[PDB]
Design an enzyme around this catalytic site. Structure first.
Site, PDB file in Angstrom:
ATOM      1  N   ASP A 138       0.248   0.946  10.744  1.00  0.00           N
ATOM      2  CA  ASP A 138       1.252   0.796   9.893  1.00  0.00           C
ATOM      3  C   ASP A 138       1.979   1.633   9.139  1.00  0.00           C
ATOM      4  O   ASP A 138       1.942   1.568   8.051  1.00  0.00           O
ATOM      5  CB  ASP A 138       0.780  -0.486   8.959  1.00  0.00           C
ATOM      6  CG  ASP A 138       2.028  -1.392   8.182  1.00  0.00           C
ATOM      7  OD1 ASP A 138       2.953  -1.187   8.653  1.00  0.00           O
ATOM      8  OD2 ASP A 138       1.720  -1.943   7.098  1.00  0.00           O
ATOM      9  N   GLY A 159       0.872  -5.319  -5.283  1.00  0.00           N
ATOM     10  CA  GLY A 159       1.100  -5.433  -3.941  1.00  0.00           C
ATOM     11  C   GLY A 159       0.016  -5.802  -2.891  1.00  0.00           C
ATOM     12  O   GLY A 159      -1.155  -5.447  -3.396  1.00  0.00           O
TER      13      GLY A 159
HETATM   14  C1  LIG Z   1       2.386  -1.562  -6.142  1.00  0.00           C
HETATM   15  C2  LIG Z   1       1.821  -1.666  -4.738  1.00  0.00           C
HETATM   16  C3  LIG Z   1       1.475  -0.321  -4.242  1.00  0.00           C
HETATM   17  C4  LIG Z   1       1.720   1.037  -4.863  1.00  0.00           C
HETATM   18  C5  LIG Z   1       1.273   2.205  -4.373  1.00  0.00           C
HETATM   19  N1  LIG Z   1      -0.295   2.223  -4.942  1.00  0.00           N
HETATM   20  C6  LIG Z   1      -0.708   3.368  -5.524  1.00  0.00           C
HETATM   21  N2  LIG Z   1       0.300   3.984  -6.613  1.00  0.00           N
HETATM   22  C7  LIG Z   1      -0.213   4.864  -7.216  1.00  0.00           C
HETATM   23  N3  LIG Z   1      -1.228   5.677  -7.037  1.00  0.00           N
HETATM   24  C8  LIG Z   1      -2.148   5.205  -6.176  1.00  0.00           C
HETATM   25  N4  LIG Z   1      -3.148   5.757  -5.650  1.00  0.00           N
HETATM   26  C9  LIG Z   1      -3.798   5.117  -4.633  1.00  0.00           C
HETATM   27  N5  LIG Z   1      -3.092   4.112  -4.668  1.00  0.00           N
HETATM   28  C10 LIG Z   1      -1.777   4.285  -5.303  1.00  0.00           C
HETATM   29  C11 LIG Z   1       2.110   0.872  -6.265  1.00  0.00           C
HETATM   30  C12 LIG Z   1       2.504  -0.456  -6.653  1.00  0.00           C
END
Ligand SMILES: c1ccc(CNc2ncnc3[nH]cnc23)cc1
Length: 343
Positions: A138, A23
């Protein structure tokens, strides 16, 4: 170091990689941290081709490195090349989170208790953010990372700004606006994306989404977005009409048929009445009559958690440059995680 989906190269400290998702101009994996002996998350970021991508990256990094709070995701380590010319990717290492509120709401209807304590944690983190004179801008379910019902963290400060009620430009589409469904009416009507009220409105939308398992104002576009809001809150009053700092904006509403306010209990029959009173105050059309973060925490709905003695605030209150200048600033902000760093 996998090559199937863009070379990662985060070793030798971070090994045993595994794909999570992707993402915002990059990719995300989980890896084993051989120093802390625990699995962490790593976001690979390649923003240097597009100036707006460089904005959000630098924006989020500066803020998260300064912020320190249980309910706000932090940055553990940043990996990048020794020289600016070599730097094409940035690796942000953060605590691994099992899921997010968006994914959770797709699979489970939340009980009142878990809605209540989720709400507290969001407002707890938000209180800190606002105390640093910063707006997230956001806030939405997918930006609320979750491990357990007791472990919620706010993420994605890419659109974050320092609060500034004064400056105004009415630049509607010249500024990269927030996620439509969670966007305060003042932002859509008279371009007001620099006051704390907008974050409170988002939290209201998140609260309503927790009670019914679906977005409360799911407009297709910004005019349809206003349509949903007025469709529930009712036609704006004469005084709320004066809050509109725009000629053409105060027209589409006046042509619309008169809408009665739909009672919250009629929309959410099974909801806690205290929850609905708080929701009512978070989703007030008038940004000046909208409840503030400290007042929300002190609402009877959160009285079993509210504790100013255990709610940390910032110890100190907290752009349009080309993509090459921003890259330098990112190179400097991440320089503290480099070997040999001084001062
Ligand atoms: C695609 C886009 C965003 C996410 C969300 N991020 C995320 N997922 C898991 N652990 C985390 N620690 C800090 N950020 C994250 C997951 C998949």
């Amino acid at each position: 170091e996998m090559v199937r989906g863009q070379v990662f190269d985060v070793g030798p400290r971070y090994t045993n990689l595994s794909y999570i998702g992707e993402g915002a101009y990059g990719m995300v994996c989980s890896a084993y941290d051989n120093v802390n002996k625990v699995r962490v998350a790593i976001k690979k970021i390649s923003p240097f081709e597009h100036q707006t991508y460089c904005q959000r990256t630098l924006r989020e990094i500066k803020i998260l490195l300064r912020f320190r709070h249980e309910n706000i995701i932090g940055i553990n380590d940043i990996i990048r090349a020794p020289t600016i010319e070599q730097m094409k990717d940035v690796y942000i290492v953060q605590d691994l989170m099992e899921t997010d509120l968006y994914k959770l709401l797709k699979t489970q209807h939340l009980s009142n208790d878990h809605i209540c304590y989720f709400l507290y944690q969001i407002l707890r983190g938000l209180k800190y953010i606002h105390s640093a004179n910063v707006l997230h801008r956001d806030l939405k379910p997918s930006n609320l990372l979750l491990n357990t019902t007791c472990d919620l963290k706010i993420c994605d400060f890419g659109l974050a700004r320092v609060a500034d009620p004064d400056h105004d430009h009415t630049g509607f589409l010249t500024e990269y606006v927030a996620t439509r469904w969670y966007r305060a009416p003042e932002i859509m009507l008279n371009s007001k994306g620099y006051t704390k009220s907008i974050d409170i409105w988002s939290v209201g939308c998140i609260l309503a989404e927790m009670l019914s398992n679906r977005p409360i104002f799911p407009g297709k576009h910004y005019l349809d977005q206003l349509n949903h809001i007025l469709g529930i809150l009712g036609s704006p009053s004469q005084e709320d009409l004066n809050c509109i700092i725009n000629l053409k904006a105060r027209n589409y509403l006046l042509s619309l048929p008169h809408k009665n306010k739909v009672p919250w209990n009629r929309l959410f029959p099974n909801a806690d009445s205290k929850a609905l009173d708080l929701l009512d105050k978070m989703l007030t059309f008038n940004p000046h009559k909208r409840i503030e973060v400290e007042q929300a925490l002190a609402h009877p709905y959160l009285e079993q958690y509210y504790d100013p003695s255990d709610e940390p605030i910032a110890e100190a209150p907290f752009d349009d440059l080309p993509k090459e200048k921003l890259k330098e600033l990112i190179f400097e902000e991440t320089a503290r995680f480099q070997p040999g760093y001084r001062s």
